[PDB]
């Protein structure tokens, strides 16, 4: 029993440890957000193959409890062919905990511009100041589609957090102001670096610009699109919601959205089944080919992964709490606790 440890608003990526967890689940009272609505019915997520993973690290040897308080974990879901093989929570989350995602959202949003070609509403080789004439007059006008899903736009982009000057630091602060088209206007304003679809520039605003892209195309709220073509269709067991810009704002394609351990990883089963929901196939066909053309998985910083091995049919969903946003030694042992799991389902 203890009063909430939420942080302001501009201190999202520089928290005390206690405090990341309780505002990691409390995103809705810390910024604007949207709901993402589940449905009536509910997928499924049978138990499946219980296993108790063990790996090694050095010279010892770690079990799950190990893997957990090491590395700070709230929570861990194993599906293998769509059963839980294994689901633990932590950090004082259980089963009705809505966690936000960082970087993982990237994936999400960019499997919702794969839903939004398969229905017409976007075409990869369009233009995206078509979509977003106020992109008119920037670098960005000519662009296709395709290249702002590639990160191949290229256009300047600085990343980096510590520069205050960074391109990443203005669209927080744009985030921080709320007011609606600021990343935009960012956006807007960045020069030309490289030809368009020759260099790869991982840029957040670019990852923001596919929740721009599909409000456009769709005409919707993003949280509603996502809800129509996924949350509601297959059927999350929660509703989720999305970190915006601004109040009743946009959706931040890149960061914000929060969603139980089981609605993450009916997701990842969703993307694992080609995105067919019933027979509809709401994804194109080798979309998922395709968005992962050389296993794949999203990663988030201070340790969010959603792992997905087709070949195996598992679907892994990892929420951690790491004190930086990236470290080395937790890599290596989330890499080396899901490889056991997977060894382990075999």
């Given at each position: 029993?203890?009063?909430?440890?939420?942080?302001?608003?501009?201190?999202?990526?520089?928290?005390?440890?206690?405090?990341?967890?309780?505002?990691?689940?409390?995103?809705?009272?810390?910024?604007?957000?949207?709901?993402?609505?589940?449905?009536?019915?509910?997928?499924?997520?049978?138990?499946?193959?219980?296993?108790?993973?063990?790996?090694?690290?050095?010279?010892?040897?770690?079990?799950?409890?190990?893997?957990?308080?090491?590395?700070?974990?709230?929570?861990?879901?194993?599906?293998?062919?769509?059963?839980?093989?294994?689901?633990?929570?932590?950090?004082?989350?259980?089963?009705?905990?809505?966690?936000?995602?960082?970087?993982?959202?990237?994936?999400?949003?960019?499997?919702?511009?794969?839903?939004?070609?398969?229905?017409?509403?976007?075409?990869?080789?369009?233009?995206?100041?078509?979509?977003?004439?106020?992109?008119?007059?920037?670098?960005?006008?000519?662009?296709?589609?395709?290249?702002?899903?590639?990160?191949?736009?290229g256009?300047?982009?600085?990343?980096?957090?510590?520069?205050?000057?960074?391109?990443?630091?203005?669209?927080?602060?744009?985030?921080?102001?709320?007011?609606?088209?600021?990343?935009?206007?960012?956006?807007?304003?960045?020069?030309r670096q490289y030809p368009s679809?020759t260099h790869?520039t991982?840029?957040?605003?670019?990852?923001?610009?596919?929740?721009?892209?599909?409000?456009?195309?769709?005409?919707?709220?993003?949280?509603?699109?996502?809800?129509?073509?996924?949350?509601?269709?297959?059927?999350?067991?929660?509703?989720?919601?999305?970190?915006?810009?601004?109040?009743?704002?946009?959706?931040?394609?890149?960061?914000?959205?929060?969603?139980?351990?089981?609605?993450?990883?009916?997701?990842?089963?969703?993307?694992?089944?080609?995105?067919?929901?019933?027979?509809?196939?709401?994804?194109?066909?080798?979309?998922?080919?395709?968005?992962?053309?050389?296993?794949?998985?999203?990663?988030?910083?201070?340790?969010?992964?959603?792992?997905?091995?087709?070949?195996?049919?598992?679907?892994?969903?990892?929420?951690?709490?790491?004190?930086?946003?990236?470290?080395?030694?937790?890599?290596?042992?989330?890499?080396?606790?899901?490889?056991?799991?997977?060894?382990?389902?075999?």
């Amino acid at each position: 029993v203890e009063n909430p440890r939420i942080g302001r608003a501009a201190d999202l990526y520089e928290l005390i440890p206690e405090y990341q967890p309780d505002t990691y689940r409390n995103m809705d009272k810390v910024y604007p957000t949207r709901v993402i609505h589940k449905g009536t019915k509910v997928r499924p997520l049978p138990a499946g193959v219980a296993i108790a993973p063990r790996y090694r690290i050095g010279g010892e040897e770690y079990g799950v409890d190990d893997f957990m308080r090491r590395n700070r974990v709230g929570g861990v879901l194993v599906l293998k062919d769509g059963k839980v093989a294994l689901e633990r929570y932590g950090l004082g989350n259980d089963e009705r905990t809505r966690w936000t995602s960082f970087s993982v959202v990237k994936s999400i949003s960019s499997t919702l511009v794969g839903a939004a070609v398969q229905q017409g509403l976007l075409a990869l080789d369009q233009p995206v100041d078509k979509y977003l004439p106020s992109l008119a007059g920037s670098a960005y006008q000519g662009v296709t589609v395709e290249q702002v899903l590639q990160m191949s736009s290229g256009v300047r982009w600085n990343e980096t957090y510590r520069d205050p000057k960074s391109d990443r630091r203005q669209m927080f602060d744009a985030q921080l102001a709320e007011r609606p088209g600021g990343i935009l206007r960012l956006l807007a304003s960045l020069p030309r670096q490289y030809p368009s679809g020759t260099h790869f520039t991982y840029s957040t605003g670019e990852s923001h610009l596919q929740s721009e892209l599909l409000h456009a195309a769709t005409r919707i709220p993003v949280s509603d699109y996502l809800s129509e073509r996924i949350w509601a269709r297959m059927g999350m067991e929660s509703d989720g919601f999305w970190q915006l810009e601004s109040p009743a704002g946009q959706e931040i394609g890149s960061s914000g959205l929060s969603a139980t351990l089981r609605d993450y990883g009916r997701f990842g089963q969703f993307v694992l089944e080609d995105g067919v929901i019933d027979g509809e196939r709401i994804l194109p066909e080798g979309w998922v080919d395709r968005a992962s053309r050389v296993a794949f998985e999203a990663q988030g910083i201070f340790g969010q992964y959603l792992y997905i091995n087709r070949k195996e049919k598992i679907v892994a969903v990892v929420w951690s709490a790491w004190p930086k946003p990236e470290m080395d030694d937790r890599e290596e042992e989330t890499y080396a606790f899901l490889g056991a799991a997977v060894k382990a389902l075999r």
